[model samples]
Target chain A: GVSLKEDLKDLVRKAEEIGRELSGKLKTNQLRKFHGHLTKIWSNYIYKKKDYRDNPEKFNEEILNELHFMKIFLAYQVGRDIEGISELKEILEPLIDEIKTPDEFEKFKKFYDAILAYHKFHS
Target chain B: GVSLKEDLKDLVRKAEEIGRELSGKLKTNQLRKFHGHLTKIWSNYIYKKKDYRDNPEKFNEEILNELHFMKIFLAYQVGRDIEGISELKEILEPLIDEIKTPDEFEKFKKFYDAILAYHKFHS
Candidate 1:
């Protein structure tokens, strides 16, 4: 029930827990795939945010499609029975859906960045 | 060769390695003590930084003393031959000494924060 806008610290702590525990159950190679996925989305986020700086609604709409692609990718990977991928999906899907503005996207980006960093810390 | 001012990402990666590897060799109780130490210094940093916002030189000098206290404490911990405490000191002391301005201190602060986070990720 943590809202990213209302409870960023709480949300970030949750991301840390998810990343640390998930990395323990995943192979390093498996974790790498998720990192690659996150980076792709991050790159997309950066470009869109820059290009659409004057048009928040367009940025928000376009960015959601990028995150939706990530959702689809994660779901496919989870279906393959990759350990810990489902948890990644579970935590991210809600945050992705919650992102409706550039500032909201930036918050999700930081939250996602924390997960990746924590995962690397353990792996 | 990594300078926090010039290469924050590289510096942060090194901190991750230090924290992750250090935690693996430390008792949880030992790690907890270090966490307590970090939080104390962090609290001090936050409070002093706010009060001295307009006085960069004063804030820089005062903050260095706080970091110096941390240095002295870490050195004593290392002398006890506690596993991995020396590595923690080795990484932190240089950064403490390098801080001559508020902006520089903020970089060191981020670097130190990374160590604490990664340590928790593994511990």
Candidate 2:
């Protein structure tokens, strides 16, 4: 029971610590960068699309697709059930390109393309 | 109307393309590595935990905590709502240490601890 109780307590403590850290340190800008990187990699190489700026709407659409692709990809990468990826993507994809800021868009573009590129070459 | 329709069509097309690429090229091993890297970075850097090997359950518990931390951290970093980050964390946390593979556990350890570490300095 020591292992289980300790495990539970450890989980609670770490979770709370992480939550504190998240509240204290994890800012919107940082999250933007992380998502940007993930999205760029998913779009450019994994999804294999070279042009986004030429067509903003098309680019946005591709980004959503790649977002879905990446959720699944990331889920699979972590050895989760594929369905979980689908569900996660469903929740996350609608937020892309909605903020309407140049910097945010750039982050989106980078993340979309980078994952795409990673998938293109590595897979 | 044209823009909306075009966007919708483009979404469908790109989604299809992404699906094709994912089906064709994305491999499980590659996903493992990607998740491995992400998990390691999140855990070791973002979450700030030093020991895992000594206490396996404690380590696993910390990993789950950090995994939840990371989902929120990532969502926030990406510009999604703070609540969304919380929701995403809920979905991702439970899977952190369930699989029981040494390599997967290592990946989880790396991710949980890295994010903890990242938060420590970056914040």
Candidate 3:
């Protein structure tokens, strides 16, 4: 069993490692596979450890999916995969458009883009 | 103060009433205005009365958004506004796609569609 902070730190470290491994070796199909696997693992971790009573607003599947997508987007950015990032943007654009309210759209969009930018620079 | 079941029934009845009122009176700007007000009122009701611990899985903004969209969609369907329903479909399809796993998507999809179909028939 691990503490929540430790678990999150480990997840971040793994993301960084994957970023380093993919650097300059970008492959779209491979990135897709990696994205799929990361999504599964991240969902499992969230479902198992999340204390919804403590923070119900953040514990839903939508937020979880968004977080996983950000991690994959970050890894691709670190690997200098502009096309891959562009693909992600295409994928997410319509979902963002579906959002009914401007405030909600802006909130999620800012978080999603910030993660992408962070990975672009730091990964 | 009403029981949850009664509140939900009242909501359904009110949605039906609104549907009848909007029938053959569909205006794009008016529909947009109605959607805005309904979203705000529904959000207020959910946030104020929801008990997270009892059903953490369903008590988030994402589900709330989805539900509100379905209601609006139902109203639009009843009013025979194919354009509005199509617009709502455009908004929701991408969201359904962004879901990471097939199982989760299927679960929500069934419930979402059933509601829309119900209103299409019974509203």
The estimated TM-scores of all candidates read: 0.31, 0.21, 0.18
Residue A103 lDDT in candidate 1 = 40
User: How many backbone clashes does every candidate have?
Assistant: 0, 52, 0
Q: Which model is ahead, 2 or 3, in terms of DockQ? A: 2
CA lDDT scores, all candidates in order: 0.43, 0.41, 0.39
Query: What is every candidate's C-alpha DockQ against the true complex, given to 2 decimals?
Result: 0.02, 0.03, 0.01
lDDT (tens digit, per residue) of candidate 1 on A41-110 = 4556556545655565664466445544544554454333322332343444454445333344334444
**What are the runs in model 3 whose C-alpha is more than 4 Å off?**
A1-28, A32-37, A45-55, A60-123, B1-123
- When sorted by TM-score, best at the front, the candidate numbers are 1, 2, 3
Q: Candidate 3 chain A — worst ten consecutive residues by lDDT sum?
A: A22-31
lDDT by residue for model 3 over B35-102, one digit each (tens)?
A: 46445645654564445325445444644455455445544433333333333333334444454443
In candidate 1, the residue pairs with backbone N, CA or C atoms under 3 Å apart (3 or more residues apart, or in different chains) clash, namely: none
Candidate 2 lDDT over B44-82, as tens digits, reads 633544454445565446544444444454444334333
Best by TM-score: 1
Candidate 3 accuracy as TM-score: 0.18
Ranking by lDDT: 1, 2, 3
Better of 1 and 2 by lDDT: 1
DockQ of prediction 3: 0.01
